[PDB]
Design a protein around this ligand. Sequence first.
Ligand SMILES: [Mg+2]
Ligand SMILES: [Mg+2]
Length: 270
Amino acid sequence: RPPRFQRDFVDLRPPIRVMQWNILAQALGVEALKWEERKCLILEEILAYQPDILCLQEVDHYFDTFQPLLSRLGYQGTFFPKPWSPCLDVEHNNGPDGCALFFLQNRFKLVNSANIRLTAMTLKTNQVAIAQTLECKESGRQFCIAVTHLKARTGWERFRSAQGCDLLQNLQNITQGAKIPLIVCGDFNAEPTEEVYKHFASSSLNLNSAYKLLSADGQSEPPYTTWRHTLDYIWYSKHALNVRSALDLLTPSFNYPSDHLSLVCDFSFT
Ligand SMILES: [Mg+2]
Ligand SMILES: [Mg+2]
């Protein structure tokens, strides 16, 4: 059976379902897997999990594929490209990859939105973030959702730390301290041992990382979020939101369509 149907939700307890996924850019992708087939696997994965909020990185097919197909399913979407996408250094590419944020229109109202270009000690980086304030149409309850993709690879630890810090400061401005509860999705490109992780875990935004709740004592991150590194997280205001559920890890048409595992959580307000 296909991997999307191999994973099970673990009960931790009308919730808000958040999906976090580096989907692996087309231009950046023995035999190999064609774009036509692979994009379908990506779409089939999203439809199976039917999230309220979808946060993506490495999207280089936003305008031809994901926005028109997800719009038809009731998702309002926002896209923000990297200023110098590495996708452009590839022959026959489809343009720049970037971050993308989708949410169900029939359940949320957009309050405000911010396309952030991350800086690192005043330096303008190639990494971006999108932060949106959403309003739940049924309860009027407001929360902020952010999606980011931090700089990859060994050797950029101090750089990730700095740009992570800039993001934290931006979110702190938007959420006016803690007046507005917060959820952050990302490929942070750092293991829990890096400083940028420790900054998020110790920020005065009082964030916690969702997938830790899948571990035996709930006190440690999962052994990997790729398909041997743990690089993806979902962060949430620990005093305003609780995790009711999380999608557990895995172990041709059965190919997983990305080198990062999708993260999925169900949230509700405390
Ligand atoms: Mg990648
Ligand atoms: Mg990566």
